[PDB]
Design a protein around this ligand. Structure first.
Ligand SMILES: Nc1ncnc2c1ncn2[C@@H]1O[C@H](COP(=O)(O)OP(=O)(O)OP(=O)(O)O)[C@@H](O)[C@H]1O
Ligand SMILES: [Mg+2]
Ligand SMILES: [Mg+2]
Lengths: 147, 76, 985
């Protein structure tokens, strides 16, 4: 638990990801605040999104709870920040680090998946009227992810 | 060499292995046939629990040997 | 007509039909010693029609070694007469009687006959009758550290369920023309060769939907075959399959036929040559008793051992057994003949009671036919076991002194044990400790902790409690009961009502733990197990773990400096469903039940809490606005639970329930179909509602439908409970109120700056001030499954079934809904008895202080299939630190409360290791990459001061140590693991 978390933190420190920055809040090793930069080739470009990571008492044998804190207009992210990602519910295996989770979240941001949505209305807009989806996503990122 | 693994729930599994195979290979085969991760498998043969890093010949496991795949229970 | 308020956990193991058939069966038990009384107790708790006892032998003192319904005031009285009165209290639905004379024909009155402490001639006489009249016959025996069981259910026993597993079901993707069934993506069918399955909802092959079972040929983990389906069609798409379980015919042999050529059941595969030895040994015991006026060989007597070995050789010659008799093992059987251990009695009684239930219910696979067991590795080796030490002393422990001796009895009497939990396993463990004489000496003591209270459903397997005790504290009642059993424990048991966890370290501290001899876990969750394991590892105390689930069980032992801990291994985690599946696209009843539970919580629990917190905190609005993820929904909840939708009668509650029905079963489905029409296709052209996604349909409210009325009643009642109004139940008022309801129009919406703040402020000012509402509070609904008059499970069942009707899913009844939503763990009394017996057999090994790892055994068993297995514990891993051998688990560093810089210098100088990270609890005290100014600030402080500063909380007065985890690198820069640090404050 503690040794694994410290190993991950040290590994993150050695090489700056340049696209994510995760670290313990205050001094609590099991609670981290992460930052994600919106992909350049995406509606969310030029936006900073804050995530809260809660490691369980049984880490790495149970998935960490990752929640978006910044408001985002995405088909697979609801208003509570919940993320529809497989690697965090049942595919969680104690073999991949938090950097992999952050990369997965960034990939999800770069291209949404409306075939298995979490917000049906946004997926419907994405499938039917793409331009409206792009405008809404850009407006939301401008008015929530900047400032 | 062919061995049998009996689960605590009554299921029977047939594995094709060789005497020189390690316990890790057997656990990987059991994962392939059942989906149980190797770290969560408890194999017992002749009163000895098999440990990763050793070979079958170290436990004197021969053809048509029977292993038991067990698990711990949280109730009580 | 089964009382589900008592047999709740047992019906999830057996079922309604099994228990219904069991409640019409009579059981006769011959012999009322420890084994007989254990079997009778388990049978009475199970719920058979009645029990009859037969044991005219007068009570003796040594009989108290394992008979816990006998007292020293009953010496000279027949055992059955003194036991019936105490057995009649366990269960009120099971009468218990005594017969003073047994005749052969009388046996025809009983469904099952159990025989203990009876000579072989009488057993043959009884079996010759039971076999030809189709009566189940079981015979059990317990001699010292050896045991035997024999079962004979007749030549034509019919077993309906063989393994006790739920039928397997799955969703098919495609069925080819040659019967090759393929599962959905990454889904395993789990079938074996020869199983039978039946299909439904198959498109393109209607013939497979008739319901006729078909053979299964497992061609892989994902695909199987059913044969040739050429005629029925060309290819089938989608659909479901369900396994069909067929009865089996089992043929038993009589005891007379079985003696010549027995069929063995092997509890341990490490010793497969022994059961042939025990078969001869037990017959030789019977012959010896018949040649000495029914007297067994005296304890540790050489003359009797020689005569017994002569009998063994004679029997082996007579039966033409081609086995080489092991003189040491056989003479060991002779020495311990007069032994009577409560642990062996509990183990065999649990097994035999399960066999009796199998005979009555025709379920699970029975033992076929001989089961010979030994635990000879428990014999002490650190004491003198001889004829002089094992001779009886005329006390209640003679049955145990005849196996272990007086010196080991003194060792047992000086134990200081700690039992965590007082559930079923806790009650069994306390019984065993009382019978064994644990902690009855001057320096002995027992401590038991449990914070729960007795309930009606607990009485089905926790035999120390009675209906008059419902509502009391488990630990106090168990302590009193076991003091009644063994009066020597009066004043030597301490009961706490504290939960063992991080919050109770002021009671179970260093002083408490340093005096113990061993810890026994009797819990029902993994968190407490891990916590207690860590505490035992730190204090270096032996730990005995045990767990059960239905008919399965396991027991493990943790020995300091020898084996690994409980937390060094992993177990499968509990399964949770993805949020997307629960929210919009369910395909199983479990998904609907989870959604219904969330709906219950969000309708009757969360808004009430928000309203109450608003009226309590004078400035809750600011916190809600700046902290909640969805403050506007909180404001809406407060507004519509205070002013707008506040009910003034029950008719308003009924109208609210109708509105909620429309909201959650008619309108959201319409919106979902507006977003994803039934004819829509994915981005790749495949239809959207294909596979695990089922197209829903809106529900139109019809009062004549039962589920709609159930939902209305439950929702209205729960809303009234929240607002504390009188709730009606007569359907006439519901029909009258709902008749005059005019639904508001609804049309799905297509979607399409400072207004939101304006709306929030408008809502805020509309809320009445808290000053105007003083003393007015709303009652939240706290989920409670076990109460059937609160409409909790009723509401969950109704909502789940309505959502199933939305998506065309087969609804589940209230029984399964309670099992799933309540997360009930199936439980049995037989499994509890078996695990307690195994744990108490390991306890004597722990007391003797055995230093080798081959002498301890971890046990696993499944009583549904009759499987037992044992394995040595895993030795604790070793490592090399600074050229020294270090135990990875049981070693630690002992350092004073020195400065952080002094600690780093100590590690650099002595171990030659560079400290890189140092953490205590969940705080990072020191890291190598921190800025130099922060380190300079934190370097000259002591460890205690540093912990207090980082955690921002003072250390408790009772804190006597600090456990620090340190990660360090060697000179070359390679990470090396080191044991934790125990700083002494
Ligand atoms: N952390 C703990 N500290 C002390 N006792 C505990 C702890 N966790 C659980 N227990 C107790 O362990 C016992 C577990 O036994 P069991 O699960 O059979 O009982 P139960 O939970 O009351 O019943 P049921 O599970 O049938 O509803 C219960 O007395 C429970 O109160
Ligand atoms: Mg309870
Ligand atoms: Mg429980």
């Amino acid at each position: 638990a503690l040794k694994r978390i410290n190993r991950e933190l040290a590994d993150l420190g050695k090489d700056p990801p340049s696209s994510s920055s995760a670290g313990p809040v205050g001094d609590d090793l099991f609670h981290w605040q992460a930052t994600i930069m919106g992909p350049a080739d995406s509606p969310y470009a030029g936006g900073v999104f804050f995530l809260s990571i809660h490691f369980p008492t049984d880490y790495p044998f149970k998935p960490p709870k990752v929640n978006f804190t910044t408001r985002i207009y995405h088909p697979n992210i609801n208003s509570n920040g919940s993320i529809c990602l497989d690697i965090l519910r049942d595919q969680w295996s104690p073999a991949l680090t938090i950097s992999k989770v952050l990369l997965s979240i960034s990939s999800l941001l770069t291209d949404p998946n409306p075939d298995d949505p979490l917000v049906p209305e946004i997926a419907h807009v994405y499938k039917t009227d793409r331009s409206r989806y792009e405008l809404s996503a850009r407006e939301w990122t401008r008015k929530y992810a900047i400032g | 060499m062919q061995i049998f693994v009996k689960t605590l729930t009554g299921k029977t599994i047939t594995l094709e292995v060789e005497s020189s195979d390690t316990i890790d290979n057997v656990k990987s085969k059991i994962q392939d046939k059942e989906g149980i991760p190797p770290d969560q498998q408890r194999l017992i043969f002749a009163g000895k629990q098999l440990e990763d890093g050793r070979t079958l010949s170290d436990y004197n496991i021969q053809k048509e040997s029977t292993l038991h795949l067990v698990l711990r229970l949280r109730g009580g | 007509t089964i009382d589900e308020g008592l047999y709740s956990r047992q019906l999830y193991v057996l079922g309604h039909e099994a228990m219904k058939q069991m409640s019409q069966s009579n059981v006769l038990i011959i012999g009322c010693k420890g084994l007989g009384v254990e079997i009778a107790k388990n049978v009475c708790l199970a719920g058979v029609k009645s029990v009859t006892l037969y044991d005219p032998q007068p009570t003796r003192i040594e009989d108290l070694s394992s008979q816990y319904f006998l007292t020293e005031d009953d010496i000279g009285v027949p055992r059955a007469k003194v036991t019936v009165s105490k057995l009649a209290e366990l269960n009120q639905y099971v009468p218990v009687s005594v017969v003073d004379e047994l005749s052969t024909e009388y046996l025809k009155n009983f469904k099952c006959v159990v025989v203990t402490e009876t000579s072989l001639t009488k057993q043959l006489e009884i079996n010759d009758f039971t076999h030809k009249n189709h009566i189940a016959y079981i015979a059990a025996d317990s001699r010292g550290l050896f045991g035997s069981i024999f079962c004979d259910f007749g030549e034509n026993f019919i077993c309906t369920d063989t393994d006790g597993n739920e039928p397997l079901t799955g969703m098919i993707a495609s069925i080819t023309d040659d019967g090759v069934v393929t599962m959905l993506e990454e889904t395993r069918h789990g079938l074996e060769n020869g199983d039978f399955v039946k299909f439904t909802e198959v498109k393109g092959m209607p013939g497979l939907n008739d319901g006729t079972p078909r053979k299964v040929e497992v061609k892989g983990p994902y695909t199987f075959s059913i044969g040739s389906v050429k005629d029925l069609g060309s290819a089938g798409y989608n659909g479901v399959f369900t396994q069909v379980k067929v009865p089996t015919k089992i043929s038993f042999k009589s005891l007379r036929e079985s003696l010549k050529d027995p069929e063995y059941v092997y509890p341990d595969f490490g010793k497969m040559m022994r059961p042939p030895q025990y078969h001869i040994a037990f017959q030789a015991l019977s012959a010896f008793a018949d040649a000495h006026e029914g007297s067994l060989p005296r304890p540790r007597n050489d003359i009797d051992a020689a005569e017994f070995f002569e009998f063994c050789k004679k029997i082996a010659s007579t039966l033409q057994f081609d086995v080489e008799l092991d003189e040491k093992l056989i003479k060991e059987i002779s020495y311990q003949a007069r032994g009577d251990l409560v642990a062996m009695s509990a183990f065999l009684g649990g097994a035999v009671a399960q066999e009796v239930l199998k005979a009555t219910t025709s379920k699970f696979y029975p033992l076929k036919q001989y089961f010979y067991f030994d635990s000879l590795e428990s014999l002490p080796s650190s004491v003198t076991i001889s004829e002089e030490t094992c001779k009886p002393r005329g006390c209640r422990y003679d049955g145990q002194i005849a196996v272990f001796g007086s010196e080991f009895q003194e060792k047992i009497a000086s134990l200081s044990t700690f039992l965590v939990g007082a559930g079923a396993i806790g009650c069994e463990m306390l019984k065993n400790w009382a019978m064994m004489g644990v902690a009855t000496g001057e320096s002995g003591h027992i401590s038991v902790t449990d914070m729960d209270s007795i309930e009606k459903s607990n009485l089905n397997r926790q035999f120390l409690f009675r209906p008059r005790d419902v509502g009391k504290l488990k630990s106090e009642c168990a302590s009193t009961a076991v003091s009644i059993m063994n009066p020597s424990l009066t004043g030597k048991i301490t009961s706490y009502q504290e939960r063992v966890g991080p919050e109770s370290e002021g009671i179970f501290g260093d002083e408490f733990f340093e005096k113990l001899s061993l810890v026994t876990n009797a819990l029902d969750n993994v968190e407490a197990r891990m916590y207690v394991d860590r505490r035992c590892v730190f204090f270096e105390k032996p730990l005995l773990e045990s767990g059960t689930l239905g008919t399965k069980g396991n027991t493990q032992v943790v020995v300091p400096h020898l084996t690994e801990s409980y937390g060094s291994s992993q177990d499968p985690p509990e399964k949770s469903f993805p949020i997307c599946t629960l929210k919009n696209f369910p395909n199983r009843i479990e998904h609907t039940i989870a959604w219904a539970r969330d709906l219950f919580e969000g309708l009757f629990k969360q808004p009430i809490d928000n309203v109450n917190m608003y009226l309590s905190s004078p400035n809750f609005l600011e916190t809600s606005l700046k902290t909640s993820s969805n403050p506007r929904e909180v404001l809406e909840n407060i507004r519509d639970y205070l002013v707008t939708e506040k009910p003034l009668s029950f008719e308003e509650c009924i109208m609210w329930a109708r509105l909620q029905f429309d909201k959650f079963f008619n309108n959201n489905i319409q919106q979902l179909l507006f977003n994803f029409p039934k004819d829509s296709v994915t981005s790749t052209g495949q239809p959207f509602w294909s596979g695990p996604k089922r197209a829903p349909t809106p529900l139109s409210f019809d009062i004549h439908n039962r589920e709609h009325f159930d939902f209305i009643v439950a929702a209205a009642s729960l809303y009234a409970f929240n607002y504390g109004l009188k709730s009606e139940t007569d359907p006439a008022i519901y029909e009258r109120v709902l008749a005059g309801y005019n639904p508001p129009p609804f049309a799905p919406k297509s979607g399409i700056a400072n207004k939101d703040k304006q709306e929030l402020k408008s809502i805020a000012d509309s809320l009445p001030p808290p000053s105007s509402l003083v003393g007015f509070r709303l009652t939240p609904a706290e989920f409670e499954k076990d109460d059937d008059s609160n409409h909790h499970i009723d509401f969950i069942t109704a909502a789940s079934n309505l959502r199933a009707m939305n998506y065309d899913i087969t609804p589940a009844d209230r029984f399964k809904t309670k099992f799933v939503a309540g997360k009930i763990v199936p439980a049995m009394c037989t499994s509890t008895a078996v695990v307690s017996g195994l744990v108490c057999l390991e306890l004597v090994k722990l007391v003797d202080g055995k230093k080798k790892i081959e002498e301890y055994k971890n046990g696993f068993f499944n009583l549904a299939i009759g499987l037992f297995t044992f394995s040595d514990p895993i030795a604790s891993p070793k490592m090399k630190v600074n050229g020294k051998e270090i135990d990875k688990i049981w070693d630690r560093y002992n350092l004073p409360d020195c400065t952080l810089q002094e600690l780093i210098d100590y590690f650099q100088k002595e171990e030659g290791l560079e400290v890189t990270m140092l953490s205590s609890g969940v705080s990072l005290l020191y890291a190598n990459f921190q800025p130099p100014k922060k380190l300079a600030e934190r370097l000259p402080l002591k460890i205690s001061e540093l912990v207090e500063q980082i955690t921002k909380k003072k250390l408790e007065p009772f804190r006597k140590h600090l456990v620090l985890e340190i990660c360090c690198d060697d000179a070359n820069g390679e990470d090396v693991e080191v044991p934790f640090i125990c700083i002494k404050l």
